[PDB]
C-alpha cells in the first residue's frame, strides 16, 4: 500500500502515503489501474529528490540527489507505454527552505508531508519509439 485514491470520472485523485518514493508509487498506481496514457500533475512535500540532467551532445547524464526538505511546487508529466509497459515521463519544480527553486527531469522523490496528485486517464494506447540518434524515447503516434 503506497497510496489511497478517489476516482472521479476520467481522473483519479491520488494521495501518496507519507515516506514513500513518489515515482515508484505513481508507476505502481498506473500499473494497478491499467492506465494506458494520461497526465499526472500535483504538489506535495519531500525530504529527498533525484533529478537527471541529460547532455544531448555527449550523451552524458548527471543524476543529482538532494537530501533536505523541499516543497513540490509543481510535478508535471505524462503516461504512455512501450511494449505495453507503463512509461512515465515526469518533470518537477521544487522549492528549498530558502524558497529558491530547483527544476528538472524527475527520477525519484521521497515524500515527507503530503502528496496530492491528479492522474487523468485518457483510455487511449499512446506509444513511444526509441530514437537511437538522440538516445531518447519519443512519442510515436502511428505505432
Instruction: Please report, in range form, the residues annotated as the binding site for Fe(3+).
Output: 89, 91, 105
65 versus 123: smaller Cβ distance to Fe ion:
65
Least separation, in Å, of the C-beta of 50 and Fe ion?
13
Specify the residue for cell string 500535483.
42
Paired with 82 in beta bridges are 85
Phi, psi for residue 96 in degrees, rounded to 5: -85, -175
Least separation, in Å, of the C-beta of 103 and a copy of itself?
3
24 versus 105: smaller Cβ distance to Ni ion:
105
Paired with 141 in beta bridges are none
> Does residue 108 touch Fe ion according to CB under 5 A?
no
Q: What is the DSSP letter of 17?
A: P
Number of residues that bind Ni ion (CB under 5 A): 2
> Does residue 105 touch Fe ion according to CB under 5 A?
yes
> Does residue 82 touch Ni ion according to CB under 5 A?
no
28 versus 102: smaller Cβ distance to a copy of itself:
102
For residue 34, is it left (φ>0), alpha (ψ between -120 and 50) or beta?
A: left
| Three-state secondary-structure class, residue 26 | helix
Least separation, in Å, of the C-beta of 75 and a copy of itself?
8
Least separation, in Å, of the C-beta of 69 and a copy of itself?
6
What residues between 56 and 75 interact with Fe ion by CB under 5 A?
A: none
Within 8 A by CB and 6+ apart from 105, the residues are: 51, 52, 53, 54, 90, 91
Residues that bind Fe ion (CB under 5 A): 105
Amino acid at each position: 500500500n503506497m497510496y489511497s485514491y478517489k476516482k472521479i470520472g476520467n481522473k483519479y485523485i491520488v494521495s501518496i502515503n507519507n515516506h514513500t518514493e513518489i515515482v515508484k508509487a505513481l508507476n505502481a498506481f498506473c500499473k494497478e489501474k491499467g492506465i494506458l496514457s494520461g497526465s499526472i500533475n500535483g504538489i506535495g512535500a519531500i525530504g529527498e529528490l533525484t533529478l537527471r540532467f541529460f547532455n544531448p551532445k555527449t550523451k552524458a547524464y548527471d543524476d543529482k540527489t538532494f537530501r533536505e526538505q523541499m516543497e513540490i511546487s509543481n510535478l508535471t508529466g505524462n503516461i504512455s507505454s512501450m511494449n505495453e509497459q507503463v512509461y512515465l515521463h515526469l518533470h518537477i519544480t521544487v522549492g528549498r527552505s530558502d524558497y529558491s527553486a530547483l527544476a528538472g527531469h524527475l527520477l525519484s522523490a521521497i515524500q515527507n508531508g503530503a502528496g496530492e496528485f491528479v492522474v487523468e486517464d485518457y483510455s487511449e494506447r499512446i506509444s513511444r519509439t526509441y530514437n537511437p540518434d538522440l538516445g531518447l524515447n519519443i512519442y510515436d503516434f502511428e505505432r
